[PDB]
Amino acid sequence: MYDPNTSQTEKQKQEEFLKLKIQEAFNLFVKDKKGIVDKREIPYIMRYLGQFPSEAQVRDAILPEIEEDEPSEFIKYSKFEPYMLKVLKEREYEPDDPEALLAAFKLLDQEGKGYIEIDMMKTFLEKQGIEFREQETKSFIEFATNKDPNATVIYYEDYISRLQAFTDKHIESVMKGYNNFQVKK
Amino acid sequence: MYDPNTSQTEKQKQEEFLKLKIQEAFNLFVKDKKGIVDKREIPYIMRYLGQFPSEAQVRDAILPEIEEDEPSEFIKYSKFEPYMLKVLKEREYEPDDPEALLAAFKLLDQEGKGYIEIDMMKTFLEKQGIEFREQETKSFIEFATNKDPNATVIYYEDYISRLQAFTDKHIESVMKGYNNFQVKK
Amino acid sequence: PIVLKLQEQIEKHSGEWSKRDETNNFEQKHETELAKMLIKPVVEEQIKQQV
Amino acid sequence: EKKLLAFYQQERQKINYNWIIAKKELEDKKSELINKEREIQDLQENHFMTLN
Amino acid sequence: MSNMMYNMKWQEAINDLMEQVTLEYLPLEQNEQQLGMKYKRDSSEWFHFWATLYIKYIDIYKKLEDCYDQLVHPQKRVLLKEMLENVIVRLCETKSQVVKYNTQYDATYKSDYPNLDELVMDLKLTPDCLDIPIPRYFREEDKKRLDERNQILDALLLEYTDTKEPQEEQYEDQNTLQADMDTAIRIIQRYERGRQGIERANLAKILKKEEEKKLERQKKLAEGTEIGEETEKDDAALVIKKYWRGYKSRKLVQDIREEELLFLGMKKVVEDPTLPESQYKQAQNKRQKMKYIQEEHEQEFNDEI
Amino acid sequence: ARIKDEQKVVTFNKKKLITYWRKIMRIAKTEQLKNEIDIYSQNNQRELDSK
Amino acid sequence: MPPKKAKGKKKKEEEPDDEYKSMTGADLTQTLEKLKERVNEMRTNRNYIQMDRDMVENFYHNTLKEISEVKTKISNKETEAEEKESKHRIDVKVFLQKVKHLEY
Amino acid sequence: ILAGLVEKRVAKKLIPASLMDLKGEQNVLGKIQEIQADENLKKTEALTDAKLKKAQLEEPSTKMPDPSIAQIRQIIAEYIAFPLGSKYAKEKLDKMNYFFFMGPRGSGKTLAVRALAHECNAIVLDISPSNIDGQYTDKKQIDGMINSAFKVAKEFQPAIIYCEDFEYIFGQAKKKKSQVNPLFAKMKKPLMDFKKGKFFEPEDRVVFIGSTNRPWDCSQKEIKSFFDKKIYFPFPNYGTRMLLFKTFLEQKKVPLPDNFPINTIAHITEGWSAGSFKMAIDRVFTERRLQKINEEQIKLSEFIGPLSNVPFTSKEEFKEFKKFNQVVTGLQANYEAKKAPADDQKGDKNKKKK
């Protein structure tokens, strides 16, 4: 998304591009009142830009950070955009290393079968770590098995490949037009 | 193919291009006599170059202008070279933009299933517009369904993507032989 | 010395086989006549040792 | 692209000399083949003469 | 075509051996004739002669070793082994001579890596001809001693490590992260939560696009635009037809290219070596039978002796 | 972006060469098959004379 | 453990001062036309050489195939000759035995 | 002795392999490369600037065309297998019973050793640190280890002794605190003792090879004085990289696209040894990736990441390889023998007797 190693003008241009994409993501869940969205949409607007905060990290920092002195169910985009731009510039919540996920899935597949049982993955996600909702677990299983109802073991290598492709496509969609991106005076 | 956005030398180059591509496709389509190929192969010959003529188009404009004064069943290459030269220069029958097919298949699938049943595709391309013959319709359905004989529907989006890719590949092959001709002294 | 040994063994092969008819030995079996020439000295040596 | 051209030209020269080797071997095999047909015909004539 | 070709090829190998011996002697003959004076036989000429002799002796070694391995006559085979070892020694001597005379570029590099590219090109030989293959008779000869040695080694392997196979140098991948099982679980959890947040944002955007498009359609309909729908499917089919004609012509062209690839030569065909009918596997059964024949023939020769 | 006067638009020389050498090699291979007409005719006539 | 790649100060390349620093727009148009078709004179040399080399390799494959076929048919012919010579030997033996049938 | 070596992993059988496993094209332009190197040396010999001339002469002669894989295989065959597999060849050929292998990991040192052992029917005696680490903690224990390995090698003809990573036994004490046990560097003394004793007879079908991934860490003088001949497995060139890439692609049976940039991937892999090259190829093409190969074409970017992730050898290591090879093989001595001027005489050297 953002390139923090550019010149002054390029840094400003990418900061403005990040601000525009932050506004896009925020409007994605702006439902009733313009400029403010439900703080629960904050993680999803966060991920739209290529940043993957966990639910715990969100609730602990991102929610109060963009929340006013008095915590509010909705977080104004006025406060949301600066923190979003900072995070995009710093790559704070950018997706973890593909190699890191490969190692994690190798660990989960302790037997090195090249695949991990979907039942075991469900147990891990719903009883270990930040327990996913059943919807989150089902979505992960679907994306890992390529929406295979008969699937019972997830081949983590191609699951990571699919996740890489999807994230790359989404990031390209968010970052597109930057080459033709013009900064107003 | 032909790019009318060049100088005089490049314009002559592209004129001789259209000429030489006519020559080469005709040579590939010739049975006995040099410089003359059947009018029926004219759609095939120029689709070998990158044209997408309607059958009515070939019957009505391509053939009458390329034919001589008296009714003849063969075309002189010396005559089709000028006509096909102008045709490629004006890009009259170049394959239109792929979202054309996208919208075509979307309109055909009136029920919005994300796919068109094989029967519906057969009806659309046999009773609507120019009529595919049995072979044309069957091969169309096969390639659109990815050679799945058992499929009761045609994945029109997949067919569109594959058709666009194949069109680009063959057009690149055609332009391989598009460009050089130097002014001969 | 290698070249000399090669020449000597080539002369051996020539004098042993170049005039030998290989038409009847289709499958390339060991020649019994060459076997006899290789074998006679063993018996000669045994008799010499006993005497 | 220049390096590509150099590599492909080297491969072409190698496989041209391979043409030469393979074709000469084929000609030798064909000459042996003809000699062997002649051998069989002569053997047939000899066997028939012996039978007679 | 096995035995007669073997005999003729051995005869040709012997003839080439005489040719190389004569090529060695000829410098000797010239030296004896005209060393009343002194030859300006430069180290360059000497090195060229020795490189030619070395290549010739590599070829002679290869041919003679193959003949010794395959030719089924044991009386022939023993002497062929002897003369093959002789050719080995002579080839190494020629290599040493080439090392000695490697004074090209006015420098005395006596290395063992001679670049024979120019000589091979001059003599019309393949670059692969410079490759020296290791003998099989190294394992073959005195195999009974080697057989006992390897059998004892395998017995030791089985009794000690339970595995007689060669050990593998462990490619310890550097991409093994030292993270906990819960660490991996939560890393995957963050991945999936980010993916699901992206999906939720995309779904909200798609829904909003849905209301926007519905509103635009309603406004257009209220604008009194009489949008015909009959010709929509007809033109859809016609465009599909033009595209399909293009694709069918393209597939015809690509199949023409493939057929040129096969017949006219534009493509190699990757044959399956594992196929017994594959020329290689058929001729492999050929050598299997013929080598069992060679074994039985050596047995018969020993029994006859 | 330099693609139309000494960089990119020289497809013809060796693509029109592709087609022209297709013509040439078609002529040469047809001539080779015609020469094999006489070659295989001599072989067949010899076999019939042999037969 | 993952050795995170350092956020080194990016290139900010001080654009080399080559011969690419001494022309104007019209001189561009000219140098355009001076390198615009030809550099793929060269790429097309590569493509035509690829065509030629593929043809060459397939014809070499054909020649090796013919060599193997002629070898195999020579083998079959030699087997036929050997078996028929065995037939001749057996016939000669049978006639030298027919010097027994005639005796009887 | 053989059973004990096997138990300690000393005496073993190496995987069936051939020297041709070293994938590297014949030096098609070897003479041209040598001509250009000689021309460059001549050009550098005529410089007027003293410091520039000194700097140019100080670096190892990288201008030398690195030995082709075919040349490496030819030398290995002639100088080992003929001495190794053929007793008459060993008796009548160069009587050299020790060789030094230089080259990067996966460049073909261990592969060539295994190929030699297998193709000559030679049982291997890996006394390398990677094989003996954590097993021996006494100098007398190492003495017995070396004695038993050499005895097994001599007895079971053919037999070879392998010391991979040769730089760790003949190291320098002047260096800092080395991670490898100095007890392992201690094997240098028994090696010299045995060599000076001449246990390997000229007719014996045994040879000791010190294969080092860090020949520069090896001793130039000691490698000169210990191993009769030096074999260096240089990194794949343009042609060698093409050969390795095609060989691994065919080994994995991945279909090759018509317009695929095989040479482009070779260039992007430029500087990658054979082992790292194959590791990167396998990482790019996994089992499920292999299955999807019929679905997904091979892409150049598929190696951008895996290539940068697989171990890569620094051009500094390249130059160190070249320098150590040139020095140890006596190449530097031969180079210096011809550049020494004879103008200096044998004059006054007596006045300064105090």
| Cα-to-chain-centroid distance, residue E19 | 32
Q: Which of B9, B177, B181 sits opposite F18 (nearest CB)?
A: B177
Alpha carbons B158 and H21: distance in angstroms, whole number: 44
Backbone dihedral angles phi then psi of residue H127, each to the nearest 5 degrees: -100, 20
Contact residues on chain E for D21, CB-CB shorter than 8 A? 126
Alpha carbons A65 and G76: distance in angstroms, whole number: 88
- For chain G, the C-alpha Rg in angstroms (whole number) is 39
Is A38 within 8 Å of A73 (Cβ atoms)? Answer: yes
- For chain A, the C-alpha Rg in angstroms (whole number) is 18
> Which helix (H) or strand (E) segment is B27 a member of?
helix B8-28
Alpha carbons D50 and G91: distance in angstroms, whole number: 9
* E 233-262 residues inside an 8 A Cβ radius of G: 261-262
Alpha carbons H338 and H334: distance in angstroms, whole number: 7
| Cα-to-chain-centroid distance, residue E57 | 24
Is H85 within 8 Å of E135 (Cβ atoms)? Answer: yes
Query: How many CA atoms does the CB half-sphere of H274 hold within 13 Å?
Result: 27
Residues forming a β-bridge with H12: H124
E153 touches G at CB < 8 Å: no
Among B87, B100, B119, CA closest to B18: B87
**Identity of the amino acid at E189:** Q
Burial class (CB in 10 A: 0-12, 13-18, 19+), E232: middle
Q: Taking CB atoms and an 8 Å limit, are A7 and G12 in contact across chains?
A: yes
E267 touches D at CB < 8 Å: no
Alpha carbons E134 and C51: distance in angstroms, whole number: 48
Buried residues in H207-217 as b, exposed as e (16+ CB within 10 A): bbbbbbbbbbb
**Identity of the amino acid at A14:** Q
Buried residues in B70-81 as b, exposed as e (16+ CB within 10 A): eeeeebebeebb
- Give how far Cα F18 sits from Cα of B17, B28, G43, G54, Å: 14, 12, 14, 13
Is E189 within 8 Å of A125 (Cβ atoms)? Answer: yes
CB proximity list for H229: less than 8 A, separation 6 or greater: E112, H75, H79, H94, H96, H99, H100
Q: Taking CB atoms and an 8 Å limit, are B180 and F16 in contact across chains?
A: yes
Contact residues on chain F for B176, CB-CB shorter than 8 A? 11, 15
Burial class (CB in 10 A: 0-12, 13-18, 19+), H352: exposed
For chain C, what's the residue count?
51
Query: Are C and E close enough to touch, i.e. 3+ CB pairs under 8 angstroms?
Result: yes
What DSSP line would sit under F28-51, residue for residue?
A: HHHHHHHHHHHHHHHHHHHHHHH-
Torsion of CA E119, E122, E124, E127, to 10 degrees: 30
DSSP 8-state secondary structure symbol assigned to residue B61 = I
Burial class (CB in 10 A: 0-12, 13-18, 19+), E40: exposed
Burial class (CB in 10 A: 0-12, 13-18, 19+), B89: middle
Q: Per the structure block, which two tokens stand in for C14?
A: 């020539």
Is H276 within 8 Å of H106 (Cβ atoms)? Answer: yes
Contact residues on chain E for G71, CB-CB shorter than 8 A? 1, 283
What DSSP line would sit under A95-145, residue for residue?
A: ---HHHHHHHHHHHSTT--SSEEHHHHHHHHHHSSSPPPHHHHHHHHHHHH
**Identity of the amino acid at H312:** F
Q: Per the structure block, which two tokens stand in for E229?
A: 């729908």
Alpha carbons B152 and B47: distance in angstroms, whole number: 30
Q: Taking CB atoms and an 8 Å limit, are G45 and D5 in contact across chains?
A: yes
Q: Which of E2, E3, E4, E268 to mutate to test the interface with D (most CBs of D within 10 A)?
A: E4
Alpha carbons B159 and B139: distance in angstroms, whole number: 12
Specify the 3-state DSSP secondary structure of B153: strand
Alpha carbons H265 and H280: distance in angstroms, whole number: 11
| Cα-to-chain-centroid distance, residue E65 | 22
Alpha carbons H278 and H246: distance in angstroms, whole number: 11
Distance from CA of B142 to the nearest CA of G (A): 32
Specify the 3-state DSSP secondary structure of H261: coil
Specify the 3-state DSSP secondary structure of B114: coil
**Identity of the amino acid at F38:** D
Alpha carbons H313 and B114: distance in angstroms, whole number: 52
| For residue B43, cis peptide bond before it (omega within 30 degrees of 0) | no
Is C4 within 8 Å of H92 (Cβ atoms)? Answer: no
Among H305, H90, E258, CA closest to A161: H305
Alpha carbons G23 and G29: distance in angstroms, whole number: 10
G6 to chain A: closest CA residue = A5
Alpha carbons A48 and A42: distance in angstroms, whole number: 10
DSSP 8-state secondary structure symbol assigned to residue E129 = G
Query: How many CA atoms does the CB half-sphere of E295 hold within 13 Å?
Result: 8
- Give how far Cα E281 sits from Cα of E92, E284, E288, G68, H68, Å: 35, 5, 10, 12, 32
G69 touches D at CB < 8 Å: no
Backbone dihedral angles phi then psi of residue H207, each to the nearest 5 degrees: -150, 145
Q: Per the structure block, which two tokens stand in for E212?
A: 């926007």
Contact residues on chain B for F30, CB-CB shorter than 8 A? none
Burial class (CB in 10 A: 0-12, 13-18, 19+), E107: middle
Torsion of CA D39, D45, D51, E1, to 10 degrees: 10
* Alpha helix positions (H), chain H: 2-7, 30-45, 50-58, 69-76, 82-85, 87-92, 109-119, 129-132, 139-155, 182-185, 188-197, 220-226, 238-251, 262-268, 274-284, 287-293, 304-309, 315-328, 331-339
Alpha carbons E303 and B26: distance in angstroms, whole number: 75
Q: Taking CB atoms and an 8 Å limit, are A5 and G2 in contact across chains?
A: no
- In terms of phi and psi (left: phi > 0; alpha: psi -120 to 50; beta: otherwise), the region of H296 is beta
Alpha carbons H142 and H10: distance in angstroms, whole number: 12
Specify the 3-state DSSP secondary structure of H99: strand
> Which helix (H) or strand (E) segment is H211 a member of?
strand H206-212
Contact residues on chain C for E290, CB-CB shorter than 8 A? none
Alpha carbons H206 and H11: distance in angstroms, whole number: 13
**C-beta neighbour count of B133 within 10 angstroms:** 9
- Structural biology method used: cryo-EM
Q: Taking CB atoms and an 8 Å limit, are C30 and E293 in contact across chains?
A: no
Specify the 3-state DSSP secondary structure of H141: helix
Is H236 within 8 Å of H23 (Cβ atoms)? Answer: yes
Q: Per the structure block, which two tokens stand in for H171?
A: 């190291």
Alpha carbons H307 and H280: distance in angstroms, whole number: 6
Among A119, A184, A123, CA closest to A152: A119
**Identity of the amino acid at H89:** A
Is H33 within 8 Å of H65 (Cβ atoms)? Answer: yes
Among H210, H106, H105, H112, CA closest to H168: H210
- Give how far Cα G13 sits from Cα of G8, G10, G20, G21, H189, Å: 14, 9, 15, 15, 54
Burial class (CB in 10 A: 0-12, 13-18, 19+), F25: middle
Please tell me which chains touch D, using 3 or more CB pairs under 8 Å as the contact test: E, G, H
**Identity of the amino acid at E134:** I
Buried residues in B156-172 as b, exposed as e (16+ CB within 10 A): bbebbeebbebbeebbe
H49 touches E at CB < 8 Å: no
For chain D, what's the residue count?
52
| Cα-to-chain-centroid distance, residue B40 | 13
CB proximity list for F16: less than 8 A, separation 6 or greater: B20, B24, B177, B180, B181
Is E69 within 8 Å of E76 (Cβ atoms)? Answer: no
Residues forming a β-bridge with C18: none
Torsion of CA H7, H8, H10, H12, to 10 degrees: 30
Q: Taking CB atoms and an 8 Å limit, are F11 and G35 in contact across chains?
A: no
F17 to chain B: closest CA residue = B177
What DSSP line would sit under H23-52, residue for residue?
A: -----TTHHHHHHHHHHHHHHHHT---HHH
Q: Per the structure block, which two tokens stand in for H349?
A: 């050297």
Alpha carbons B183 and F40: distance in angstroms, whole number: 46
A101 to chain G: closest CA residue = G2
Contact residues on chain D for E127, CB-CB shorter than 8 A? 14
Is G84 within 8 Å of D44 (Cβ atoms)? Answer: yes
**C-beta neighbour count of B150 within 10 angstroms:** 5
Backbone dihedral angles phi then psi of residue A75, each to the nearest 5 degrees: -115, 125
In terms of DSSP bridges, do strands H159-164 and H123-126 run parallel, antiparallel, or are they unpaired? Answer: parallel
Q: Could you identify the residue written with the tokens 């012509």?
A: E249
Contact residues on chain G for E180, CB-CB shorter than 8 A? none
Q: Taking CB atoms and an 8 Å limit, are C13 and E14 in contact across chains?
A: yes
Please tell me which chains touch F, using 3 or more CB pairs under 8 Å as the contact test: B, G
CB proximity list for A58: less than 8 A, separation 6 or greater: A42, A43, A46
**Identity of the amino acid at F20:** Y
Alpha carbons E119 and B159: distance in angstroms, whole number: 58
Alpha carbons B31 and B40: distance in angstroms, whole number: 13
Among H263, H273, H266, CA closest to H233: H273
B169 touches E at CB < 8 Å: yes
- SS3 of H284-327: the string is HCCHHHHHHHCCCCCCHHHHHHHHHHCCCCCHHHHHHHHHHHHH
Distance from CA of B4 to the nearest CA of F (A): 13
Alpha carbons A93 and F11: distance in angstroms, whole number: 49
Across the beta sheet with H98-102, the strand order is: H11-12, H123-126, H159-164, H206-212, H98-102, H229-232
Alpha carbons H163 and H101: distance in angstroms, whole number: 10
Alpha carbons H126 and D5: distance in angstroms, whole number: 45
Is G36 within 8 Å of F6 (Cβ atoms)? Answer: yes
Alpha carbons G99 and E163: distance in angstroms, whole number: 68
Is H325 within 8 Å of H232 (Cβ atoms)? Answer: yes
G80 to chain D: closest CA residue = D40
Contact residues on chain D for G56, CB-CB shorter than 8 A? 12, 15-16, 19
DSSP 8-state secondary structure symbol assigned to residue H166 = G
**C-beta neighbour count of A66 within 10 angstroms:** 24
CB proximity list for E138: less than 8 A, separation 6 or greater: H81, H84, H85, H86, H119, H120, H121, H158
Query: How many CA atoms does the CB half-sphere of G102 hold within 13 Å?
Result: 6
- Give how far Cα H298 sits from Cα of A161, H250, H281, H285, H293, Å: 14, 13, 11, 9, 7
Count chain D–chain G contacts defined by CB atoms under 8 A: 77
**Identity of the amino acid at B109:** D
Burial class (CB in 10 A: 0-12, 13-18, 19+), E3: buried
Specify the 3-state DSSP secondary structure of H330: coil
Q: Which of G1, G10, G11 to mutate to test the interface with A (most CBs of A within 10 A)?
A: G10
Alpha carbons H33 and H63: distance in angstroms, whole number: 8
**C-beta neighbour count of A31 within 10 angstroms:** 14
Alpha carbons F31 and F26: distance in angstroms, whole number: 8
Alpha carbons H24 and H258: distance in angstroms, whole number: 23
Q: Taking CB atoms and an 8 Å limit, are C35 and E301 in contact across chains?
A: yes
Is H14 within 8 Å of E168 (Cβ atoms)? Answer: no
> Which helix (H) or strand (E) segment is H102 a member of?
strand H98-102
Alpha carbons H271 and H66: distance in angstroms, whole number: 13
DSSP 8-state secondary structure symbol assigned to residue E167 = P
Q: Which of E84, E93, E106, E112 to mutate to test the interface with H (most CBs of H within 10 A)?
A: E112
* Alpha helix positions (H), E102-172: 117-123, 137-140, 143-161
Specify the 3-state DSSP secondary structure of B18: helix
Alpha carbons E61 and E73: distance in angstroms, whole number: 19
Among H280, H226, E193, E41, CA closest to A57: E193
